[PDB]
Symmetry: D2
Subunit: 398 residues, 4 copies
């Protein structure tokens, strides 16, 4: 009985968050936690409109969230078709911002009428940047030099790669700050975003390094040199996750008819807003109009870590006069740090798997590991370009 | 399936009609009785275009209030995405207790934040202050020459020129109160940063309306001025920028607490000394080595994002809203207690408008006691929400830093 | 270093200091080619340098005439980089043939950004709010301005980091670069603030929030010292004949190097080709603090197609933080005063203080634009 | 004859700079240029105090400066001894800032009394970052991938390495912006700062690349991706020229007696000024008190390119409690991008060679090429640390 389970908890016997570790069902656990919580609110009827029934909590519990009191529905709209690399995509966008999906759809239209967009993945590798300390700067310098010898690296790479199937440690980037040493480990991770995997590899690699340098202190597995979820020039300059570039040419006629402006006006707005304005504002990596809007909408729809829009949104949007008469619009978007995955985390949930299926990238790519994640990154970059096209045209037209 | 001329009806018939008269899918809301069937039909149309027609099987869409969404929050709707909502608390802040809703799919985040809240509560709670409040829009205009743009800048800096602009700006809404103007010249280009409070609304739309009218007025004084774009990226909205870090955008907030040494050992499993050492070398030195502007924290974006999604905020705004510098130092008689503070200069937030107009997110705002407009004191609900965000970020910083220091 | 505190002649003290030093060198004959004789050490001693062992001669070249704001300037440039003066001179030529350049000073105010601490963040917030009120500012201004006839406090920009409070004081300073003057005003203003908030601890008169001699977005965004903009239009014919290239090629190089390249490199304020070269050469020649080229060099160079045929080159250079002065420091020495006289800006402008320093800042911006023009043409031609 | 040269030049409109080729002696050509110039000044007697006589213009002409009208004397002071890596240095500083030499000397004293400082060169390599363009982003991506293959690199390295003896192409860091491709070439350069040498190598390497990709357009030999003389995160994160770290421990007694403060006060000032203050100001690389002051003074004295203090001054100064009682001051300075040389440019002049000799690093190192330049970089970092120590103490003291 609910009432007596509530009475049993209000006897200080069970901590509110320890409900599923007792109640014979998930949804009922959620229901009781809600009742307990309501008594603590200045307005006990607050949760009335927060849904919770008929949701598959099995996949959520012990994997995606804790102290669950329900779920938050985010409207999902569709933008497309997105003509990219000779394929057509119907892009799911979870958002509460009016006109965003419509504007992106218009961008997609202009691209399709232009013969489509092309994209390339330039680099792939998630990172973790721990910070270690030596007794002296002279010692940290010795460690840095050691890590730079082919033998020292092979040893570290062996330890790193030995923690998982996908741990393939690439180049190692190090930076010294006195006796501190920041080490940026970079590795592919199949179709997973890879933070957990890279962390495991990093911990074992640091153990191995410790055998060679017993005086080394592991201060933190993350010394903010990754850099994860904080703006940083290092991600912009070296990339993090997937580095992608996309491009398209919009015929003058399409710019006039679909976008309601001219190539010349677009170019002038892009230079003075996305380049000069961002420069005047002191931006590192924010040379675009609204890439974060598109990245965020797709991330939420596809079960990505939305907090990662911080670095994933880095983007430089470039526009140029093209064609016989210099009236056609050449556009490109370069995104050096798209942190994305199609396996793990929120991608394990069914509704988000549905959005990934819609794009044909759900789960692991059996025949070619990482291909689904790479495809998703290309789709993001292409949709960002469609969004940039549309909003820039609107700003150009006034 | 009836012939098209004969063709409220049958699904297959609407589809056959749609295909034939080539009606775009998004116009379905204005062609079908219920909203739900509108999406149902769009889903069916879409499924035929997918390499795997059964893709949408697990994407929910039934029994959702689309009335509030249509023509306001989203277009081409094919359903909704459920994000798990967890609760962290109580958060003892400014002598009140908050139960904080967090929408996320990252395991252990809610649990970790809850631990942080616990440590704070056992320490006597946290205190916070709103330092500044004002959303911005930074349009770019052009004059024929740099000499002319300089003239405009100087004019905008005279008390009379400003009053004129402020009058035009303020005439657009009750809450539109032009605070100040920061201008910057790049040759003949002139970037003008308009800043104004906006009641309890995040305020982008309102500030934009005010900016357009103010630019019209400015145009009367300088007919040769060309309005290149209502946003010249000088706001700066949704892109990382030093200007938001240095001047603030939306709400600037600071939060602080002192964690007793005993609580650091027992709840956080570490020492004040270890925490301090990790904070300095990760949040300060590490962020400096990585070339960060505004990212002097461990994971403020995780907390900001989770609360934003739960409360109907614009999640894309976590880009600048997440700016934060986390500081830690020895406190107390024995210098063994942990003093901690989080300073967030640019929290873009609102409790009225946008996604906050939807019922499920209004529920999360009600849970915090900040839903909608504050009748008695306009903007107070939005300011309270910003303080809550900064306080929860501090709880999250406390917990994650402890785990990093510890093992 | 106490030699001129004892001995009679300055030149002798230097000879002796050299002798003493000589004993400690692994090559005592090294000082052989370091000059020291016949130099006026009187002005240097106790003002510009200590432990003096001589002087370092830097070649001074001349670029000009620089046609700026309907005047012509012969610009002195101290440098050891070959072709720099020649390249800048070519830039000046192109500008002169284009009808000259125009410039405007947009802002003027040196800064000092001390860091203070309160017991709690709640207290530092209280101090910030007090500082933003008209009465609070008036008293701090009253205190700041009482230290000098030239010190006039313009505004205050404050920033909180928990219980720390960074306060950026900004004030004009006549024709002086103004660091010393602003520091004096800041110390007195902080004393006054302390009377209102006794629990406040003055951690450092400079908390790096000024920001002096370190790259910082704050100087780029708010300006520091003099903010200046310069512009000119170069006729298509002049671009072809003097610069050996086309307007179209120049524009393409400027966008992809100065804008896109600097963006890819993660630059804050470095959207130019080589402004530091010009700033440094003029600073050394004119007795400025050369270490200040760090922020003084901030610059965004922009190029556009201009004219009826859209074949003429429009160019502009915007420099938000030129830290400069024509009185004090190295400007007190005769050789550098000679370079300032050459420009007609030596010493204080008695009638309107600040005018000589403002004129010098315009000259720097104009010369930087001449240098940008020439080097970009050379990069575009290839 | 003097006055007759004037009439001739004015009569044929012979450019002043051409005087060198005209006259015989260098000084007479300078004397005449001054006379010509004086007639054009609002105050003809302006040059009265600008020296020009008895200076060796032979080395300057056609190498260091043009349109010469004299020389500017900068006072040279000495700070030392600087106890670094078990050696003692007498450091020449050219400056007009009062108390700078005195303050730096005090810093040196505290270090000496602490048993000296230790330093290490972490990396060495000057750079040039040209920008090239391909017709499409898909093509620039192809070029990037090609440059990353071991065969493509070897080919480029061969072409680069063939322009000089010291040209040893280390690595390549590439970055795409749509159809633009920025390529950062990095190479050691013996004891020379290396800009000219690296530029030569870059031009030839770009020619070779053009043979493989005929559609590639070389937009500019420097696309600002080097980055030379402009502030940039890339130099901070990847280094440029010499990356150096220096450290020392100052006994508590020495901190009290020589520096007039406490270790605790120093530490508090360093954290809140050099770390937090610089962070609040939005600095990239400026986590120090006044490294630029020391870099500039030494650069001018030693014939370095003073405009390079822009990036050479990047520095992070760190302080912490050390010793048994935790009362001694540990200090370190890390400078990732010291652009320096002991051969070429202004180092070819005698007075500056004198300052380099004073340090024992003048010219090339026959047996260990680059050693003199590396030694000079360590000296700069060590002196910057002495300057940081002293000024921080005075700020801490009040
Ligand atoms: C529905 C959206 C796409 C959006 N749509 C439109 N349009 C008029 S539209 C539907 O035709 O594409 N306009 C703005 C808009 C943007 C800036 C502005 F000043 C006024 C209006 C935004 C606003 C977009 C906002 O999220 C980000 C934007 O602020 C970033 C920036 O440019 O700085
Ligand atoms: C559940 C979360 C809070 C999280 N929790 C924990 N814990 C062990 S916990 C549950 O005690 O708070 N640890 C990490 C973690 C962080 C860094 C690391 F190297 C390994 C693991 C993260 C990871 C959090 C991640 O999203 C952001 C993080 O990457 C930011 C950064 O510090 O750079
Ligand atoms: C005499 C000088 C002005 C100089 N002159 C010339 N010329 C060809 S010139 C005399 O005709 O103006 N070219 C370079 C030069 C510049 C970049 C290059 F890759 C190769 C050569 C420099 C070199 C310039 C150097 O100081 C700064 C420069 O590196 C800044 C940058 O553009 O990144
Ligand atoms: C003679 C010098 C070493 C110098 N010396 C001294 N001293 C008191 S001293 C001679 O004992 O070392 N003090 C300052 C000084 C510094 C900051 C201040 F607010 C007031 C005075 C400077 C000023 C130094 C200046 O060039 C750089 C400095 O501004 C960088 C910064 O700290 O931001
Ligand atoms: N509600 C919407 N949903 C999706 N796309 C939309 C929507 N409204 C406009 N668009 C986009 O804008 C384009 C045309 O816009 P417009 O000329 O305003 O006509 P309309 O809005 O009636 O379709 C469409 O082709 C489509 O890409
Ligand atoms: N599943 C969870 N949901 C919410 N909060 C949790 C959860 N697990 C732990 N916490 C938080 O972390 C704190 C630590 O609890 P636990 O890990 O059981 O260790 P301990 O028993 O040593 O306190 C709890 O007080 C609570 O605030
Ligand atoms: N040694 C120099 N000193 C000063 N200016 C020079 C020098 N050499 C060239 N210049 C400048 O550079 C421009 C180019 O002239 P020059 O070098 O003769 O080449 P060109 O044959 O292309 O005209 C001239 O306008 C002149 O002002």
């Amino acid at each position: 009985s609910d009432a007596e389970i509530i009475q049993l908890v209000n006897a200080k016997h069970i901590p509110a968050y320890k409900l599923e570790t007792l109640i014979e069902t998930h949804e009922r656990g959620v229901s009781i936690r809600r009742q307990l919580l309501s008594k603590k609110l200045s307005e006990p009827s607050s949760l009335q409109y927060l849904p919770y029934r008929d949701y598959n909590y099995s996949l959520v519990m012990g994997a995606c969230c804790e102290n669950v009191i329900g779920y938050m529905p985010i409207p999902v709209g569709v933008a497309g078709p997105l003509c990219l690399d000779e394929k057509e995509f119907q892009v799911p966008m979870a958002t509460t911002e009016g006109c965003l999906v419509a504007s992106t759809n218009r961008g997609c239209r202009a691209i399709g009428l232009g013969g489509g967009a092309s994209s390339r993945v330039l680099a792939d590798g998630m990172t973790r940047g721990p910070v270690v300390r030596l007794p002296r700067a002279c010692d940290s310098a010795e460690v840095k030099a050691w890590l730079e010898t082919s033998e020292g690296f092979a040893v570290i790479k062996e330890a790193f790669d030995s923690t998982s199937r996908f741990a393939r440690l690439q180049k190692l980037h190090t930076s010294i700050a006195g006796r501190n040493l920041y080490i940026r480990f970079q590795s592919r991770s199949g179709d997973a975003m890879g933070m957990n995997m890279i962390s495991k590899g990093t911990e074992k690699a640091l153990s191995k390094l410790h055998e060679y340098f017993p005086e080394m202190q592991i201060l933190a597995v993350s010394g903010n040199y990754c850099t994860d979820k904080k703006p940083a020039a290092i991600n912009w300059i070296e990339g993090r996750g997937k580095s992608v570039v996309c491009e398209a040419v919009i015929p003058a006629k399409v710019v006039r008819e679909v976008l309601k402006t001219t190539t010349e006006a677009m170019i002038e707005v892009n230079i003075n807003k996305n380049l000069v304005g961002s420069a005047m504002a002191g931006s590192i990596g924010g040379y675009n109009a609204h890439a974060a809007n598109i990245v965020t909408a797709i991330y939420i729809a596809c079960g990505q870590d939305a907090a990662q829009n911080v670095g994933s949104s880095n983007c430089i949007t470039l526009m140029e006069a093209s064609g016989p008469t210099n009236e056609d619009l050449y556009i490109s978007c370069t995104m050096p740090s798209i942190e994305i995955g199609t396996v793990g985390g929120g991608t394990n949930l069914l509704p988000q798997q549905a959005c990934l299926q819609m794009l044909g990238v759900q789960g692991a790519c059996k025949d070619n590991p990482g291909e689904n994640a790479r495809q998703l990154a290309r789709i993001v970059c292409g949709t960002v370009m469609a969004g940039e096209l549309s909003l820039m045209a609107a700003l150009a037209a006034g």
